[PDB]
Amino acid sequence: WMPAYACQRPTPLTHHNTGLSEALEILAEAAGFEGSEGRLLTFCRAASVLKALPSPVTTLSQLQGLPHFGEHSSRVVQELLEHGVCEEVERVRRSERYQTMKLFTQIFGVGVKTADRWYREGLRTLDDLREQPQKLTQQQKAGLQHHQDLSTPVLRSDVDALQQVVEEAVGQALPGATVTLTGGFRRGKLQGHDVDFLITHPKEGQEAGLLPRVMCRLQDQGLILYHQHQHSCAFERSFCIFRLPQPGSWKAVRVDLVVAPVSQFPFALLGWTGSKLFQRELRRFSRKEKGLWLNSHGLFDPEQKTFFQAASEEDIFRHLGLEYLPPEQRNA
Ligand SMILES: Nc1ncnc2c1ncn2[C@H]1C[C@H](O)[C@@H](COP(=O)(O)OP(=O)(O)OP(=O)(O)O)O1
Ligand SMILES: [Mn+2]
Ligand SMILES: [Mn+2]
């Protein structure tokens, strides 16, 4: 027996079923491209079960009694075991719709709705987008300008360099302010598509106006290629492309900087650490099993109209009746 919710079981970074999970995640991604959110979540859940298994699935008999393994996901795994290939997955991989939606949605500032609109309008390539600049936001133009670098996996070494410059700027702008690495790198990932940082100060309110000062410092050092600042309407944030110096060269790298007041920091850290499926599952668990609404700002009882005060992620897990999972076991 393995628990049904991803937030009730450890999911390590590395596992024994990478071929099988990858194939299911192609089908999940394709479903998302077609607005089939039910089918996306179904394939995502099945893949996450495989990530949690302590052994490779070598025969279909190892599927019996696992949750989230309905007929379609089981068929995909069966075909892979028997034939080394799943024809449905190969058709998806070869299809122009999938390839194009993958191409467009990978670009900085482009979601599924935009990519689909562009597809329906006859756009297919990055050059097609560059030929229609009136169709692009400034963020998307920046994504296209740096597309090669932004498609290159960000490495832990890049993360360490970026954390140093962000810490230097934060520390010079406001002594005592802190920088916490979040996202997939906090979960132990060796590579990623961006770097996420969470900034706060132990005195509530001292973080006010910090982010623009941090960005000014970084801009002055030549480290910023693109910056879009957004005030809270809901955390203050800056979605950036950094110019990371390397020996004899440089690389553009996506970096998200988020500011949270320290009262909300545990919720923010939990929300921003992911994985995306883990957090979806944790929020579903909270609502369905505990009657509480969890988000990146707090944990709300809608019946009592109360908020839970947490000092740590551990506090939040405890309040929900879940065993604590460190970040490296949230790789659902
Ligand atoms: N730009 C963003 N907008 C909204 N939420 C974000 C953003 N970046 C990160 N988050 C939040 C949502 C997720 O639960 C978590 C991780 O998001 P994201 O950076 O997209 O993936 P990740 O860090 O888990 O993998 P990757 O290594 O590919 O970046 O933090
Ligand atoms: Mn990330
Ligand atoms: Mn991010």
Measuring CA to CA, which residue among 105, 122, 108, 107 is closest to residue 29? 105
- Per residue in 18-50, is it b (16+ CB within 10 Å) or e — as a string? eebbebbbbbbbbbbbeeeeebbbbbbbbbbbb
Q: Which residues pair with 249 in a beta bridge?
A: 246
Same structural domain, 129 and 217: no
Euclidean distance between the first and final Cα of the chain, in Å?
A: 17
Place of tokens 């890049």: 158
The β-bridge partners of 233 are none
Residues 191 and 276 grouped into a single domain: no
Claim to verify: residue 162 and residue 258 sit in the same structural domain: yes
- Consecutive H or E run containing 155: strand 154-155
116 assigned to a ligand binding site: no
Domain with residue 50: its CATH number is 1.10.150.110
Q: Which of 244, 262, 280 is the last residue of a domain?
A: 262
Q: Are 241 and 252 in contact (CB under 8 A)?
A: yes
Alpha helices per DSSP H over 54-120:
71-83, 87-94, 96-106, 112-120
Using the 3D structure, point to which of 87, 121, 152 is the last residue of a domain.
152
C-alpha–C-alpha distance, residues 245 and 223, integer Å: 8
Q: Are residues 187 and 236 in the same domain?
A: yes
Q: How many domains in the chain?
A: 4
Ion ligand 3: residues, CB within 5 A, are: 194, 196, 256
Report residue 326 as tokens: 């460190």
The closest of 262, 244, 246, 137 to 199, measured between CA atoms, is 262
**Method of elucidation:** X-ray
Q: What does the radius of gyration of the chain's CA atoms come to, in whole angstroms?
A: 21
Residue 305 is part of which domain span?
A: 263-331
Asked if omega into 21 is within 30° of 0 (cis), the reply is no
Active site residues: 194, 196, 256
Which of 262, 283, 304 is the last residue before a domain boundary?
262
d(CA 27, CA 30): 5
- In sequence order, which residues have a C-beta less than 8 Å from that of residue 173 and are 6 or more positions away? 210, 213, 214, 217
Tokens of 79: 């075909």
Do residue 174 and residue 146 come from a single domain? no
State the ligand closest to the CA atom of 155.
Answer: 1
CATH number for the domain harbouring residue 223: 3.30.460.10
What's the gap in Å between 279 CA and the centre of ligand 2?
Answer: 14
Q: Where are the alpha helices (DSSP H) in 121-240?
A: 126-130, 138-145, 147-151, 156-173, 183-186, 210-220
Pocket test for ligand 1, best of 156, 193, 196 (most atoms within 8 A of CB): 196
C-alpha to C-alpha distances, 139 to 129, 173, 240, 271, nearest whole angstrom: 13, 26, 9, 24
Contacts of 68 (CB under 8 A, 6+ apart): 4, 42, 45, 46, 48, 49
The CA distance from 161 to 158, in Å, is 5
Asked if 143 and 237 sit in the same domain, the reply is: no
The CA distance from 132 to 135, in Å, is: 6
